[PDB]
């Protein structure tokens, strides 16, 4: 009757991994946004394409897939699964 | 028994995060590949070492770890297991 303990341990370990993967991607995209802005600022100092940088910049900040708020659902689903 | 239902919901939920994680990375690489091109373009606009960006660029576009059909393979496995 230890299947629930095995499943809960595996699912608890798995759910932790998704959260860690999410954090690194969010941390990277923040660096990329800062990375691009500093590049564009230097490009303007050299003297157009800044409209292109604005559009791709908004796409980075305007994601909708919502990688969070559903990992929380996954952690929830395990919780009432264990009490069985 | 309900154990099939609980396993099915948890695995269906988990597959969603895997697809969402992969898409965010692919969007990131395209920005990084594009951003390096602008950085490389700006360097030549300043005026000899047009290398180690191409080879890195080849490496970025030439990954061979899939993450397109392996997730699809996982989804097929879950659906097969749900029929038990």
């Amino acid at each position: 009757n230890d299947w629930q303990k095995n499943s809960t341990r595996l699912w608890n370990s798995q759910s932790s991994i998704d959260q860690k993967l999410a954090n690194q991607i969010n941390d990277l995209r923040q660096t990329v946004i800062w990375m691009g802005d500093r590049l564009m600022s230097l490009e303007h100092r050299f003297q157009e394409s800044e409209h292109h940088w604005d559009m791709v910049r908004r796409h980075l900040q305007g994601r909708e897939d919502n990688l969070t708020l559903d990992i929380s659902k996954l952690k929830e689903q395990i919780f009432e699964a264990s009490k069985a | 028994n309900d154990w099939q239902k609980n396993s099915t919901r948890l695995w269906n939920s988990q597959s969603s995060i895997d697809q969402k994680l992969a898409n965010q990375i692919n969007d990131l690489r395209q920005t990084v590949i594009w951003m390096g091109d602008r950085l490389m373009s700006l360097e030549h606009r300043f005026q000899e070492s047009e290398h180690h960006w191409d080879m890195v660029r080849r490496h970025l576009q030439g990954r061979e770890d899939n993450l397109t059909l392996d997730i699809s393979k996982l989804k097929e496995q879950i659906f097969e297991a749900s029929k038990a």
């Epitope: 292109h52 796409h59 994601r63 897939d65 | 594009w34």
Partner: antibody, heavy 119, light 107 residues
Framework: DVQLQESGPGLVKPSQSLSLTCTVT?????????WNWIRQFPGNELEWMGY???????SYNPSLKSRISITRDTSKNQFFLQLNPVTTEDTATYYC????????????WGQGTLVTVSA | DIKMTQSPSLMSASPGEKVTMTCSAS?????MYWYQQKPRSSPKPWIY???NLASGVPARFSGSGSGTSYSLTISSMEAEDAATYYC?????????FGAGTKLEIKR
Amino acid sequence: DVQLQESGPGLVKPSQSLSLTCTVTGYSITSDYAWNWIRQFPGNELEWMGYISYSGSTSYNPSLKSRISITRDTSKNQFFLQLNPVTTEDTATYYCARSVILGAWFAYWGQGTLVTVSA
Amino acid sequence: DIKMTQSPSLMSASPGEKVTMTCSASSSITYMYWYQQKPRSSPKPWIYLTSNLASGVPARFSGSGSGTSYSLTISSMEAEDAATYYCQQWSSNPLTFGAGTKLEIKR
């Protein structure tokens, strides 16, 4: 002021190659952005075919990978579409488009040319 | 692929009214766009990232929605706004368009 101007044969026989050009005016197709091909079936539903980026890397629709081929001519600022096998189901209105790399935002379009497939 | 159901397929209205369009996705998407197509013309860029308005789009137009359901709304419809509206998503290869909601005008 980018202005896409596409052209091609208006009538192709079944099981024959389709070649379309897309002249670009006011911009260089190597400088930046992606360049897409889109078609509209007679029922007025759009389908995205593929694109070729500014550097030359191309992506194609998974349902047409064995068929579609996109090539560009840098010197005269044109990119071409090739579809060797065809069928009467390819009767549509094909379009050009320039889109941002990160997303799919076709901020510019061609005038629109009609290709009908019948013998 | 993702199926972008668009409802209603064919509506009607009179000038000055309130109109809404729904475009519900089959699964989770990443980006949302809206296009306008008048007869015998290429689609025009109308709305990007489901909130922003393209250049030269009347302020009456507005976009909203999150998750899988999205909406396009005109505060006060004018006669020039009668055209088919297409919703497009970009999550993975390939992008998918909507069936198209063809607004009309009551005389």
